[model samples]
Target chain A: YESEEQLQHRILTAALEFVPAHGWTAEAIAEGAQSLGLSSAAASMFGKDGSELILHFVTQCNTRLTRVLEEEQKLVQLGQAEKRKTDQFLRDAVETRLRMLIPYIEHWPRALSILMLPHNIPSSLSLLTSMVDDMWHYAGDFNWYTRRAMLAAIYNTTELVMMQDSSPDFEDTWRFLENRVNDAMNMGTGEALVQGLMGAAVTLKNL
Target chain B: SEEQLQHRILTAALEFVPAHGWTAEAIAEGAQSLGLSSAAASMFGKDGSELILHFVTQCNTRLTRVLEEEQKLVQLGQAEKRKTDQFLRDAVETRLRMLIPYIEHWPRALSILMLPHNIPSSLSLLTSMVDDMWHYAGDQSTDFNWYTRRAMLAAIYNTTELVMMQDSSPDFEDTWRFLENRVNDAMNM
Candidate 1:
């Protein structure tokens, strides 16, 4: 008695609850569905290990992320503490993605473990990393060294977050992430500090 | 190694390409600047424009043996002082970066890049140029190798349209920035 969208939502809500505890895989998905009274054959008819369902969930997650980012761009155009707000929005966008993953990770660590993806979730992550590379150029204030270094650290931090994000409120990801931004920002201006270190490193090493 | 070399060539090409503009005319001229035949130049031009550049295209396009044999190493790859590894890396990166934001338009772009070389062989020189670059670029990581291979194949499909659109899009501006930044990043490494 539900719309297809509602069915999908239910599936995701169910899957998120399922994956964290159950781990993400076809066989386990089918096995776990028994609690809901889904016969293995019934699930298998849908796809191997209900992967069709899992694939649908991941696809929806990605599409929803993209839509959220597009909407947040409008929120970002409003003034007042804009940079801070914009940065927060970007940070929130990323956090929301993992927040969506958290219950799944906690309940089904194996399901969202990243390694399970054949192309690896890193494929999409790499696309975002590359998008950051493409988009950073438009930032009027930031220079290359600061941008690249900060993004690289952000990228690695995001990856590390998936592994260590056991937080009840999940603020630990943000807490640790601020350290990376600080390193990128460091002593003076972000640009000057990175340049200074480069010069210092070369000076220390060269002669 | 092939992947790395494609990255290098594509990087170099990105540097060299913007100067000429991103067109068959520009690419052909750029090839001539690199000491390739003048036939590529003459193809798009009136027949008498540059017979030699045209000759290069005629001779080179037919004999893909360099790529087939991977002999470009001893020839252009080495002679140009571009190590095969760096050559492949840059070439691959050039191909990859082109695909990054443009991926959504891939079907249309690819269709244009691959539409056959009905133009005179001299004008058709990009076929060989890109083909040569792609082969060397692809000789590296299989994943990247496939990525560049698809890109090049897509290039062939969208050859006419994408070539023109390349210059106008934020593509050149952003790509040049990406390349220069990559250079700075590589300096640290």
Candidate 2:
């Protein structure tokens, strides 16, 4: 028998399929439950604001990205794939992570706005910082704090660009990401870079 | 005009917030103080978001004027320009001090602003306030840093606001110390 938490996990997982159509909304959760042969009342298990669903989706994406990174790490260890330079690895990793949003791009801004609410900030921020921390973990590392801070900034700014991007295949966003990574690498000298990275980390925390 | 009347009620409503909280009860008291019926509270939704948002907007406006006056002093050479970190710490401190009047009820106010329907306006108000802070600090960059810098300041302002709410020290000294450390950390001091 599924416990309540299990039921909620199943419902939210199924709900992601409907998000592209119904958005991060209760209606989408209802649809997910109905599809799963549960009553639509299951949506009541989550918040009316749809934040739980969005956070769930973000967590799932992070998990998926982590798996991908782990698999790639395995490949490199087995000599089946070559390890890339730090900049290249970070660029590819960030780009791969952000591409997951393409399906829900139209509704991403609303999700961002929701995540910015004060009550939602702590969880939302933790998810973001953890995602960046994971990326750095797989990238094999920076200035500890400054490195993750810079990457998070690059990732967030690029995500913002991708939301408004109309270029074919998000060509512009990838270009922006590449440029940001290169800039970080070149500017890795000291004080200026740390300041920028701290600024980015703080901004993301507030967001 | 109805808008003016709403403004008047909300302005009066501020006086009652410390005692009554951000609530329809407070709005009702405000209307009564204006010699209007308590039904005037109906002009606002019962969730108290309208009242909290109005208060935030007012604070933002006041912060802007204070910033502008300070900028004028710098422009006229009447005062020396401050370093970015010091300027930011002062600005954040000044803006947060406004909440002291209603500090007892501020946690409730924060929750009200977090409501889904109110989030858009709340975020916009926060963003604009941070943008004003950066602008007055003499930032002129148009690059990606423009977004990052504002985001940084917003983070600083918000975290400090949260800290201030819990601070019990004299004059919120602990909160100011935290703010100073955050600014110095961000500026790599």
Candidate 3:
């Protein structure tokens, strides 16, 4: 959001506008920020108490745009049928959002390290891990056949977020994500076959 | 039960190092206060408690040794560059960069940074500041180092000093000047 494209993408993809389409009160906007890291004192920053209601509204609008980028990305990988139907159109926006959060993850360790970084990694990654785990589970019962591949995908994807991630890497990551969807689809098909590890050299035959 | 609590203790110790300055006492206090055993077993790598501090120490020592070796190699014309592979150089460089980021990690590296001077808001502010660095982890092209963080704190420290040197945060020019002077001194060798 510190950059112009980031700020624009965030604002546009937001689920809710900062100001309601019609009249909305300052109390409501302040309430929205309180949920995030912003404070009630932030209300004054929006305006000199009341006059800058429009400005306050606009700021809240901007905040929502930035915050949803990560959530939007997580949702797409999740591919929840019900929500996807509602938001699949936002797919491109979600992708952009995911791209932003990936690097931010590397940035996150500093927060933890400085704040006395966590002994265990954060739980947010759990669902992403679980989704991968479920993929292999569906891929076959002898998951050992798929475990290595699944683990590599998870590790490489996670590591991508951690360091040296940029254009070509991102392009590679995007393609892998599609192939992962293929894995997810296979869950119902019972065709648990060991494909090359996400197109890497790890070879395996069907169990 | 004992094993897990011990794990939690080491976890807490890593959390403390950055803001507090790395010391056995600091680790012990953070551990003991967190209801962990004061015993040695609670402070080792088999459990998670002490890994961060141990890793930092090992990495730092290894890097210093590597730097010394590299200096000797550079003195040989066409140098060690002719002998070494890119991977070797990259591996050494990666360790060095990782070491820099670890230092800013508050609570974790606070105890480990081994700073000669003291700091204000020594814990919380350090935590946020350390976290802030990651927000731009590799956004900058240069690899990580102690120079910027040191300069930032030095600038803050000088403001409180009676006859202080002027400083800027990440004072690259000043750091370059100091390093160049040091190199000139080395020519005398």
Candidate 4:
């Protein structure tokens, strides 16, 4: 027998197909239950607010991206594929993760608003930070904290750009992502050099 | 006329926020203070979000005016111009100081504004304020930099706000120091 939590997961997983039609609403949850040969009353098992469904979708996308990254790492380990340069790897990973939203992109703004709700923020933000951490884990950080924070900003900004993109295959969004990643890379090195110089000057003054 | 009355009640309600929190009782007390029937409180929503949002909107408008005045001073050579990093630090600090009067009751207000229906408007208010800050800081990028800059500042503002809520340092000295470090990190990194 499925555990109660597992059953809820099953319902939410089935709910994704209905979201494009019904949006992030209880109607989609109910439709998901019906599609699974269960009573629509199952929707009552979760909050009526639909944040649960949206978070579940985000978690699933993160897991999917991790699996993709892990597979690429395995290929590189066996010498079947070359490791991508850090910047290139980061850009590709972000694009891959964001592409998962293509199907539900129309309703994504609503999902974002839901995730911003205070009660959902902790979980939503944790999921995002974890995804970025996973990407950095694959791409390869003492600027560790700053690097993650910067990447999170990049990812979020690119996600916003993607939502409104109407270019062929989202060409404009990808270009935007590339520029941001390049900017971070150059800025990181330049800032470190400046800091080193500043420290040296202070040391000379003290001496 | 009704809108003006609600604004008046909410403004007066600010005084009772510290004591009663962001509740209808505070609005009622505010109405009573204005010689209106306490029943006038019924004019506002019960969840207290209207009052909280009103406060946030008022604060955002005030921050904009402050930024505008500072810009005029610099343009007229009456005040020295600041670097982007320093300007942002001062802007964030000035905006957050407005919460001092209601600091003790802020967490409750935050939660109220975090309600699902309120999230859209709350996020809009936050993004607009961040945009204004960047505009005043001399940012004119129309490309990806636009989104990234605003996103970064929003993150900095939010994290610092969270830190300030828990800080017990006198005059929130720790919070200001924390804000400075974050701004420096963003500027350099």
**Interface RMSD to the true structure, each candidate:** 20.1, 15.9, 23.3, 17.8
Candidate 2 Cα outliers beyond 4 Å, as residue runs: A188-207, B1-189
TM-score of each: 0.37, 0.52, 0.21, 0.51
Error of 4 at B163 (Å): 0.4
Chain A TM-scores, candidates in order: 0.53, 0.87, 0.28, 0.88
Instruction: Give a tens-digit lDDT track for model 1, residues B100-178.
Output: 4434333232222221111223224545555676566445534344443433333322222222233344655633433
Flag the better candidate by lDDT, 2 or 4: 4
What digit string (tens of lDDT, one per residue) describes model 2 on residues A117-189? 5445557778888998988888884456566567766776577566666879989778877877886787521
Better of 2 and 3 by lDDT: 2
Cα RMSD to the true fold for all candidates = 19.0, 20.1, 22.2, 22.2
lDDT by residue (tens digit), candidate 4, B1-189 = 888989999999988999998889999999999999999998888878888999999999999999999999999999988888889999999999999999877766764454334555677799899999998998742233665576668766775675677678899898788778767656653
DockQ of each: 0.02, 0.02, 0.02, 0.02
DockQ of 3: 0.02
Check candidate 2 and list the clashing pairs.
Answer: A203-B151
* DockQ-derived CAPRI band for the predicted complex in model 2: incorrect
Candidate-wise lDDT, in order: 0.42, 0.77, 0.35, 0.78
The runs of at least 3 residues in candidate 4 whose Cα sits more than 4 Å from the true structure, single-residue gaps closed, are A1-61, A65-207, B140-144
